[PDB]
Every structure is written in structure tokens, then in C-alpha cells.
Design a protein around this ligand. Sequence first.
Ligand SMILES: Cc1cc2nc3c(=O)[nH]c(=O)nc-3n(C[C@H](O)[C@H](O)[C@H](O)COP(=O)(O)OP(=O)(O)OC[C@H]3O[C@@H](n4cnc5c(N)ncnc54)[C@H](O)[C@@H]3O)c2cc1C
Ligand SMILES: Cc1cc2nc3c(=O)[nH]c(=O)nc-3n(C[C@H](O)[C@H](O)[C@H](O)COP(=O)(O)OP(=O)(O)OC[C@H]3O[C@@H](n4cnc5c(N)ncnc54)[C@H](O)[C@@H]3O)c2cc1C
Ligand SMILES: C[C@@H]1[C@H]2C[C@@H](C[C@H]1NCc1cn([C@@H]3OC[C@@H](O)[C@H](O)[C@H]3O)c3ccccc13)C2(C)C
Ligand SMILES: C[C@@H]1[C@H]2C[C@@H](C[C@H]1NCc1cn([C@@H]3OC[C@@H](O)[C@H](O)[C@H]3O)c3ccccc13)C2(C)C
Lengths: 593, 593
Amino acid sequence: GTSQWLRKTVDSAAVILFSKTTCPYCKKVKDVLAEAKIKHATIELDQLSNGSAIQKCLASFSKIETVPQMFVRGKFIGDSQTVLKYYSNDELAGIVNESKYDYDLIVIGGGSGGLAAGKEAAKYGAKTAVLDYVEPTPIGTTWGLGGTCVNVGCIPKKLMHQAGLLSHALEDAEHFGWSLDRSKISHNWSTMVEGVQSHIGSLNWGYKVALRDNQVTYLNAKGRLISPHEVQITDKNQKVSTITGNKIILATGERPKYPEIPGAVEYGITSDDLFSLPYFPGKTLVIGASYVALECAGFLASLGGDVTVMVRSILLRGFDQQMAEKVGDYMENHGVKFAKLCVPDEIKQLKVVDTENNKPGLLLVKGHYTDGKKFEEEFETVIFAVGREPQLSKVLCETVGVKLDKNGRVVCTDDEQTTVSNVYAIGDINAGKPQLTPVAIQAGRYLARRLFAGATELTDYSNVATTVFTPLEYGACGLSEEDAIEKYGDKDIEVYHSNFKPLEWTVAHREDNVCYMKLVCRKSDNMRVLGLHVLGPNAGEITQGYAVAIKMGATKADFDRTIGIHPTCSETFTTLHVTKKSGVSPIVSGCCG
Amino acid sequence: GTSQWLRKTVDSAAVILFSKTTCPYCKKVKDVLAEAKIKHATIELDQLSNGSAIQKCLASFSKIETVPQMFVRGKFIGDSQTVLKYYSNDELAGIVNESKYDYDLIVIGGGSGGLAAGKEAAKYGAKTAVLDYVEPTPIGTTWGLGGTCVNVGCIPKKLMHQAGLLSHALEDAEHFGWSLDRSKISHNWSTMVEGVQSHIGSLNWGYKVALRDNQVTYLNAKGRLISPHEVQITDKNQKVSTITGNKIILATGERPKYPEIPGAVEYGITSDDLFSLPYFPGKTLVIGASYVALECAGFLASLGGDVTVMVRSILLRGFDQQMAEKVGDYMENHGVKFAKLCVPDEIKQLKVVDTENNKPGLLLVKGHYTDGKKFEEEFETVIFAVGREPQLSKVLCETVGVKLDKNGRVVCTDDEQTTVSNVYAIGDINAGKPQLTPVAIQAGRYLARRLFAGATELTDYSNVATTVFTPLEYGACGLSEEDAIEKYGDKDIEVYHSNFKPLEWTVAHREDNVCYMKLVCRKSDNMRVLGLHVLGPNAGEITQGYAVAIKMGATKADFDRTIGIHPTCSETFTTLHVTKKSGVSPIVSGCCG
Ligand SMILES: Cc1cc2nc3c(=O)[nH]c(=O)nc-3n(C[C@H](O)[C@H](O)[C@H](O)COP(=O)(O)OP(=O)(O)OC[C@H]3O[C@@H](n4cnc5c(N)ncnc54)[C@H](O)[C@@H]3O)c2cc1C
Ligand SMILES: Cc1cc2nc3c(=O)[nH]c(=O)nc-3n(C[C@H](O)[C@H](O)[C@H](O)COP(=O)(O)OP(=O)(O)OC[C@H]3O[C@@H](n4cnc5c(N)ncnc54)[C@H](O)[C@@H]3O)c2cc1C
Ligand SMILES: C[C@@H]1[C@H]2C[C@@H](C[C@H]1NCc1cn([C@@H]3OC[C@@H](O)[C@H](O)[C@H]3O)c3ccccc13)C2(C)C
Ligand SMILES: C[C@@H]1[C@H]2C[C@@H](C[C@H]1NCc1cn([C@@H]3OC[C@@H](O)[C@H](O)[C@H]3O)c3ccccc13)C2(C)C
């Protein structure tokens, strides 16, 4: 029965009020708690499906079945009459003072998932502490609250990709009858950086206002967990303190990697420096083939620069290789020099940085290919998106047993639960689960719901749709072609593929039959769609809806019976019939396939 | 069981071939037919639910169980031996090209649905004649083959839509570090006309090539049906001739109506004369509140010319009124006059059309509101968009019984079947079926499959999503708020609403909280999503993705389970929690809901 739910609720949370809609006394005590400015995790028993076992559990634990029953921090206050009596002597504010632990919940790391979990816990009754600190970049750049995705990540990346799309739109406007010259239009990088930084500062201020509104104690200081309840604090003023708390959330997030080569740390930069540096990188070298490196090089090239991507092994490792190759070809066509199959060796400085003149320095790069030829070049800026490593060592010494591989930090089971019962890890921390922003937010929210509200729903991690914001976006949800062939077998996987030219590219005279599209359908499950991909403009908007459709298993016949929206670039999804098994070329020019 | 499929196939389809995969003789006869360039509508017996029933029906009709069996007009030629002997004697072409009717299929109306049906029937082993003709009742520009959607309706609409969005993009490029002024930049409307007409001509050439490939004969002749198996046609040179056919497909479509008053025909223009108009309309009056009228007015306004919409009763009749008002306000905020609750009385001329230098002549408009106020203004052009009506009287003889309402339309049953057994109506004339291009295309393709290949699946006209390409696009799927309230009552309908802001509008300092999202769900069936609505940039892609999601039974909990794509607009649908019953303001700025 609901014995497990009652045990989970009573052993956690701050205040939980069991009530029903029919009983007027329950509504009265709810109103009394509301007018006292007391946040509570009320539960409606009548509307809950298991309306019988809850009464038995209440009789077993509270020794009384008369709802409403309000419970605080391991202490049973009593019925509505008891709460009214406590408020009569003005002790209701006094009795809501948490417990032996200083905080109901402490989040280490003010990232998107961390802040979402903090807000979710705060609006469910508990008093929450949030601890966010950013170790300064070796160059010296620093950002405020918001985490990686917000401060230096999702938002600035999309803003600069939109700038690149505007750059292409300037080219297309001449073919669209607008009196303007591409030779007479130039990009002011500094103004763009100032604007995006102003927007991100506004976002940080809004986040601070929101967190202080939910009665959440935020301290900008490094946190280091000592025991499953105790954590030490290193303030920016080196004022080390110590706070205890029953519930701990680990949201240390992630920090960009460096290659252990001479001169990389003191001369190179990462995404942390890229999104806030004043000058313009110009002739730029990018190290690493992760999707972040590719999109960064993409919108640096689209903004007048001439970037050289230096791929080590393969473009977009972990993604589908066919559309990875297509994306690389598109970058090559628009002025991106791909130094594939090469490995960096060392870097040096030739001309010192010119921060007084706001000009980038000059850096010499030495590397070697797979055959060891001495690759030599000079660049005005070198960016190291070689990967990302988490610094869980300096936040957890030996308290929790967390297995970690290369690029991994912890081992975690379902319900984001680690080995320690009262320690929870969300966001990028969990290994073997996607490192995305919405998944982190959902994990935090659902963790707060399960802890301080008694919820039973568990956050999903499968079929997580992603989109990379290259000059032309790539959005995928599900499985790749190679992954499907490896898992379900070559003969059990059917791929529906096509090439389409968006209606926005006709008069503009852009490239035709480049925007690719593919499906992954398995015959054993009635042509069930497994991996759905799109490559072209606004790929994320197209991909999100079809990810939603895939979530509960949309079949190929479902796509066939669905009717398109005219005119849109996504139409060809509901008109997919070409098969790779037949080998028919998907080059659709003029008349649609 | 399969008797009905067999009888409809033999009595309707042209060339049929019952065969299996395991039998090698069937593959041999397939190869023989392929070498003879005689395409066939083959059916794989071993790839169907009940092969034994098909074999029993064949024994009841073909008298022999041994597959394969090839049929022409349903006649039993025989087995593979008979077909091989006939091919050796070299008279199979005459056998397959002889019948009591001149053509197997006659399709009147060369629209997207018409060409789709023609190609689907042709590649399914049949001979078909597609007849299209356009009668320019106004001064007119007789566009070639391509139908309403391609020649006039859809493609030019989205082309000038992207022109308007490029106008907005140049306006907003100031904040993205682009060195221009938006004052020295002007517009070239003639460039619009020439480019869009060039693209239309390329599409027409592609369509002609496609119809030539599918061996379909196309004659630009007026269609006028006579008897259930014969039609008399009028060539371009007034050469009246007579053609008989086995089956008839009606795709007459519709043409814009006219508010018949003196001068409304010889002076004003409609959408037919809008997408090829040599001169820029400039200060324009728009008549009617249909989505075409608002789309055209927004196009001209964002292009630069001030426009005055003149709404009779309500904006966007048939859509949700809330977003209708929102979209109207969005045009109003960008310089679109709105003479709401007004109807026209007369139009006259002051200056003749100045065609020597391509300048529009001046016109005077007189009308009255609901209170009789004498509205009196001057416009050098008036565009009449008061809906479209079909000319069945010019295509269909009165001897056959059909139904027409005030707006026209043709009565028809579920399987696109008219009163006559071999006369079929698809496109914009079906009784109660949506007036959309994919509707016509799917209806034509599925009808051809059900006719000349014995298909079973029917085209779906339910939950047909749409998108109107106003300057702020509006895309909806399912139902509306008022429709849901009428259907199930207030207590059974729950609305989730959100006011969001695209990331592309942050630096640009565009409108905030203007964008909108609405979700209509029914409580009695597990919060099943009925009507979903989006109002923002690139709404068509989101709307189609979510229409595909909804069509196969998507609930709100399914939306919650989905992990969003960050950063885009569409993932805001996965964070829908505000309810209209609670009355919380949709406006979220920093917390973003
Ligand atoms: C350039 C770039 C682009 C990206 N684009 C996308 C994208 O489009 N979509 C997407 O889904 N994801 C994207 N990501 C990933 C995204 O940054 C993460 O997935 C997301 O931030 C994870 O959420 P979080 O709550 O862990 O936030 P995080 O930012 O990962 O949380 C880390 C925070 O905790 C703080 N912290 C760390 N250790 C401590 C400690 N001991 N004490 C106190 N505070 C501490 C850090 O200072 C930081 O503020 C991108 C990342 C980068 C670098
Ligand atoms: C301004 C405008 C915008 C539109 N935008 C959209 C949109 O965004 N999305 C969408 O889905 N739909 C849109 N439509 C609708 C779309 O144009 C039509 O619904 C589409 O053409 C339907 O296909 P059809 O079979 O009716 O072809 P149609 O082209 O409508 O009809 C076939 C053609 O045959 C002609 N014809 C008539 N009688 C005869 C005869 N006796 N012999 C020969 N030919 C004849 C007709 O005039 C017509 O041109 C729009 C329409 C207009 C006017
Ligand atoms: C669906 C989509 C589509 C795009 C490709 C991969 C997925 N998203 C990218 C991605 C997500 N993880 C996540 O970290 C590792 C795991 O923790 C997690 O399972 C995984 O989702 C990656 C890791 C390396 C490399 C790329 C990724 C594809 C085609 C299957
Ligand atoms: C989903 C969407 C959303 C937008 C509204 C209607 C649907 N599509 C618009 C529409 C489709 N028909 C079609 O022609 C008439 C009928 O033939 C057909 O049934 C109808 O779908 C219209 C007619 C007049 C006016 C608008 C329309 C709404 C809110 C339910």
C-alpha cells in the first residue's frame, strides 16, 4: 500500500498537510496556513488514486485518521484544532523552525538544474540554501549566478548563432530585393558582446530576484561536503564557515578541459573566455571535434572570420556520422578549414596580447597528423574545446563512493540516488545520462517533488532530443543509423531518407538538396520510429515536436497518416517514402519526391 | 473477406498483377513486364493478412489458384505463360491500351491534389489525362500549370512573408553589431514580382517534366463534364472536342469571390492579381477578414506601404478569437489601420491606372459602419479577399445531382465518392473538408491508391493543423477554446497558457510577452490535448510537429514527460503549468514560468 509513500514523506520535507477537498475544516486550516505566510506541501487524499491504504497508514503512524493532519520535521503537530491552538498563542511561526539540521536542503551549485530544484523545494514548504561559486578562468574571466548553460553556454551561443543567421540573411536580402550591399556591411563584434553581456546580466539579476522571492538563502561561496549532513563553506573573502543539513543536492556541474601540452593553459582559451572576450579572434584555430567546438567555429566563421577546425579523429563523436559529414561539408563550403586527422603538439606566443588596444595576440601552433607530419601555423586566437572534465575531487574527498571513468565523475542509480541515502546528484553530474539543460531542470524539479512533496513520478532520460546550432542546425532525437544497425541488426532497421530545399532558399539561390533528413524504423515493431533526424534551418523547432511524438512511440504509419502544414520545410517528414535499402538517391530537385 | 478488394480491383483498376515473393515465376513475369515498359499495380499475396482468402477469391474469379495473374480491365489474361506468349507474339501493348473508354482516368483541375492524383494513378499502371485551365475573369494574369497553391496561393505568400521577416531582421540587426542604418535601405517590389514569378515558372517546368515522365497527357483546355463517363473539352484555340473516360476526378478548386457592386470588378483586384502585380500597391485598402486578407495586408505593411484592413464582423472567422485579436493587435502595433465593424458600399476612380511607368491609379472607397457612418477614404489600390467559391456550374452538368451551399462546395461521402460511382471530388470542394493543399494532395494520392491498387486506408480530414503567415505567424492544431467549451462545457475543458519570448528578440529589444502559447485539454479522458495553439516566429514547424504528436493521442502528461530542446521556443510547451481557471497572468519575464 501507501506505507512506502508515508515513510518517504514523514522522514523528509519540512511541512506536509494531509487534507481532502470535501472536508471544510481542511480548507479552513489550509487558509489559516496561507494567511500566516507558511508554505506547505498539501496533499489531497480524496483525489489520490489509492484512497484506502492512506487512511490505514495514517492510523498506523499518526494514531489518528481524522484529516487534516499537518506534520513538521519528524514531529506530529496534530489535527486542525491543534494547529489553530498553536496559532492562537502565536507559536505557529515559532514551531516552524526546521530541525537539528541547519537547512532543509542545500544545493551545491547554482546551475539551471540546481536553481530549478531550489525553487521547486522552496515552493513546496522547505527552506533551501543554494551555493554557487565559479572558479576564475586562468585568463581571468568570471560570470555571476546562472550556471554554465545560462552565463556562458546556451543563451550566448544561440545569440551569436542568430547573428550568423543574420549574416546569411544579409546575403539573401539582395536576392530578396533589398537595397543593400554585402561588401558595404560589416560586423561590430564588440557591440554584439556588450549587448549579449547586458542581456545575460539582466538574466542573472532576474534569477537573483526569483531566488530571493522564494525565500532561498543564496551564498556565493565554494562548498565542500564533509559528512552526509555537514558541509564547509569557503567565502570569496576567505571566510570559511560550516553548515549542516539533512538533504544535499550535488550540482557542481562541469568545467571545460585542457590538453596537457606546454603553453596551453597560459595562452589558450575555452568557451568560458570565448563568450566574454573584448577583442575579435579573427584568424582562429579550434581544437577538438565536440559539437560545442563545431558550432563555435561555425558562428565565428559566419561573422567574417576564417577559422580552422582541427579535428582529431571524427566530427561530432557520438552523433550520426552521415549528417556529421554533411555538416562538415557545409562548413567547408562557407569558409571553414577542416584540419582532420591531426593531433596538437604545442603552442607558443609570438606577439603579446594587446588589451590596451583591444587586439588579439599572435600564437604559433605546432602539431602532427596521423602520419606525424609537422603541421605548423600561426593564428590570432586558439580555442581549446578538447572536452570537459568535472572537479568532483575538490568538493567530495571520501564521504561518498562514486565510481568515475574518463570524463565521468560519479555512479548513480535510478531516482538520481547515490550510495549515500540523503545525497542526491542532478544535472551533468550523473554518468550515463544526457548532459543537457532541460533534463537537468526536470531532474531537479522531480527530485524536489519526490522529496518534499511525496511525488512518485521519476524524470525521464531516454529519447532526449538535442540540437547543435551550427550555421545550419542539426536536430536529432533517438538513435543513430550505426547505433540502430549495431543494436537491432542490419536487416531489422529501415531508414527513410530525403533531401529538401526550404522555400526560403529558392529566390535566395542558396544550395539545393543539402538539407538532409533521415528516419530509423524497425520492422519488428510495426515500422516503429527509433531515430529521427533533421538537418537544416531551425532544426530544433522541428525536432522538438517530433521528439514529443516519439516519446510515446510514434510509428511510421502514424507519420504517413499525419497531414503536413503548407508551406513549411518540415512537410517532407509526413511524405517520407524513399528507402536506403532500395538505394534510391534522395536528391530531390524541382518536383518533390 | 478479400472478395470486395478483388471485385473493386478488377472493376476499377487498370493493370493488376497478383503475385508473391517466394514464387520465382512471379519475379520472372515482373521482369518481363518491366522490360516491356508496362508498369503494373502488383499486389503481394504473401505480404497480406489472409493469403488463403485471396487465393479462394482468385479461384472464385480467376478459376486458377496458381499465381501470378495479370489483369487488364479486370479481364483474365492468364498466368505467366499466357503473358509470356502474348509478349512473344508482340501484341500486349495493344491489349493494354485498348478499352471502351479513351482514357482510364480523367482528372479535371490541375492543382496540387490534381497532379498528385494523376501521378499516383499513372505510376500505379494506368493511363490518365489531366486537364487544367484558368479563366481570368478580372484583367487577369493567366498563370500556367501548377494550380492555385503553386501559381498564386502558397509559394508567393511565403516568399513575401520571408521578405517581411527579412525587413524585421534588418530592423533588428542594429543590436547584433551590424553596421547599417535602415534609412538608406529601400525596397524593390518589381524584384519581388520577377523573382517569385521566375520560381513559379521553374516549378511549372518541373511539373510539366513530371507529368511527361508519368506518361500523363496534359492539355490546357477548359473542362466541362457531360456524362458519368464522357467530358467535352474546349481547347485554348476554342477547339471543342469529346473525350470519354472510365473514371472522373473533380478538382475544380475555387476562385476568389467578389462583393458585387459597381466598380468592384473592373477596378479592384484580388489575390489572383496580387502576386504578379507589376507595380507596388503602396497605400492599400484590404477588404475582408479572411486569413488571406490579413496575410497580404501584413506582407504589404512590413514591406513598407501603409495598409488599411477593413473587417466586416470579426478577424479570422473560424479560428480562435483570442489569438485572432492578438495577431490583429500585432499588425496594429506595426502600422496597419483596422476599420473594424465596417462594410463597403462603393468604389470609384479619380486617376486612371498609370501603366506607362507602372504606377497605380487612384481610387476612392465609400462604406458604412454598423452605425451607418459614411467612411470615405482614398486608396490607389483595393484588394478584395472575401473568400472563394467554386464554379461547378461551369464544370458539372445539372443532370447529375450534387449539393452546393452559399460558399459553394460539393456533397461527398467518406471515400471521396460522389453520387456517380466513377466520379470523384477532391481538393477544396469536398463537403466539409479542410481547404488546405496537403489535404488535396493526400486525398488525391490515397484515392488513386484505393482505385488503381485496391488500397484500404482512407485519408484523414480530422485534426488538420494550419498556419497563417501573418508578420507574427499563428499556427493551430485540433480545436479552439470556444469550440471546446461548446463541445464539452466549461468544467470539462482546461486551458494551459504561456506568454513567452524568443531568444532572438532579447538583444534586438523586440516585443516582450507578445508571443503566446495555448493548450486545450479535456479532463474526462485523462487530460487529453484537444486544441494546441502557438503564436510566434516560425510557428509552422512547431505546429506541424505537435500536430503529428496530437494525431496519435498525445496527453498533457506526455508533454511533461518530454525533455525539451534548449534553447528554442517549442520547449516552452513542455513547461506549461499555468491554468486559465486560476487566472494567473501569462506574462513571465525573468522566471520564464
Ligand atoms: C558553450 C556551451 C554550450 C552549451 N549549450 C547547451 C545547449 O544548447 N543545450 C543544453 O541542454 N546544454 C548546453 N550546454 C550544457 C549546459 O551548460 C549544462 O548541461 C547545464 O549547465 C547543466 O545544468 P546545471 O544545473 O548542472 O548547471 P551547471 O552550470 O552545470 O552548474 C554548475 C554550477 O555550479 C557551480 N559550482 C560547481 N562546484 C561548486 C561548488 N563546489 N560549490 C558551489 N558551487 C559550485 C559552478 O560555479 C556553476 O555555477 C552547453 C554548455 C556549454 C559550455
Ligand atoms: C492566397 C492563397 C493562399 C493559400 N495558402 C495556402 C496555404 O498556406 N496552405 C494550404 O494548404 N493551402 C493554401 N491555399 C489553398 C490552395 O491554393 C488550394 O487549396 C489548393 O490548390 C488545393 O488544391 P486543388 O486540387 O483545389 O487545386 P486548385 O489549383 O485549387 O484547383 C485546380 C485548378 O483547376 C482550375 N479549374 C477549375 N475548373 C476547371 C476546369 N473545368 N477545367 C480545368 N481546370 C479547371 C482551377 O481554377 C484551379 O486553378 C491558399 C490559397 C490562396 C488563394
Ligand atoms: C539523441 C541525440 C542524437 C544526437 C546523437 C547523440 C544524442 N545527443 C547528443 C549526445 C548526448 N550525449 C549524452 O552524454 C553521454 C551519456 O551520459 C548520455 O546517455 C548521452 O545522451 C552524448 C555524448 C557524447 C556525444 C554526443 C552526445 C544522437 C544522433 C543519438
Ligand atoms: C485546426 C485549426 C484551428 C484554426 C481553427 C480552424 C483550423 N484550421 C483553420 C480552418 C480550416 N477550415 C476548413 O474549411 C472549412 C471546412 O471544409 C473544414 O472542416 C475546415 O477545417 C476553415 C474554414 C474557415 C476558417 C478557418 C478554417 C482552429 C482554431 C480550430
